[PDB]
Design a protein around this ligand. Structure first.
Ligand code: NAG
Length: 181
């Protein structure tokens, strides 16, 4: 019942160098991890067949895009860890539909921006980790300051990698005037 690419513990499944997201994952596996995966993107509805996941981890992957509604069909997911990845693009609705998500980690992916309203609709979120990314502070990030001010979640300090004028400045400290636009 455990997928061939993955090795499965009782409640946990680890998939390494998987060429596709398995749709056969046994129920009563609440945690799934993808390490050094073969697949280059996460399309919409990839996890539809694994509704029981409370925890998801992506690490050491190279992704062209993580699509809108990629995580649709995961009503029970509390923890989502996307870390130490190469991600070229992240869609505004990528995380749409996770109401139960408590902890979200984008940390250490070297992401240059984030789209507006990417955190829209995640109510249960107590923690977001944006550290370890190279953020270009510009018009596309201007929303992020407003979100950091009004957010209920705990977010540790993050800094602008660019442009040269703003480098190594706390994004939380910035004001909307400084963003140009
Ligand atoms: C943070 O949460 C409290 C209670 O959960 C709420 O009253 C407050 O308005 C929230 N902050 C916002 C929405 O900026």
């Amino acid at each position: 019942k455990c997928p061939a690419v993955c090795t499965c513990s009782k409640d946990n499944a680890l998939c390494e160098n998987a060429r596709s997201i398995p749709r056969t994952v046994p129920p009563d596996v609440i945690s799934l991890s993808f390490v050094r995966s073969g697949f280059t993107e996460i399309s919409e509805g990839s996890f539809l067949f694994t509704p029981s996941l409370q925890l998801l981890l992506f690490t050491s992957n190279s992704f062209d895009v993580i699509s809108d509604d990629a995580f649709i069909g995961l009503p029970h997911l509390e923890y989502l860890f996307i870390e130490n990845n190469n991600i070229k693009s992240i869609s505004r609705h990528t995380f749409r539909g996770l109401k139960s998500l408590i902890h979200l980690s984008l940390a250490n992916n070297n992401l240059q921006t984030l789209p507006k309203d990417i955190f829209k609709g995640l109510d249960s979120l107590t923690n977001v980790d944006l550290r370890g990314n190279a953020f270009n502070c510009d018009c596309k990030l201007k929303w992020l300051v407003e979100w950091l001010g009004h957010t209920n979640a705990t977010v540790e300090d993050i800094y602008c990698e660019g442009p040269p004028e703003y480098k190594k400045r706390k994004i939380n400290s910035l004001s909307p005037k400084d963003f140009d636009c």
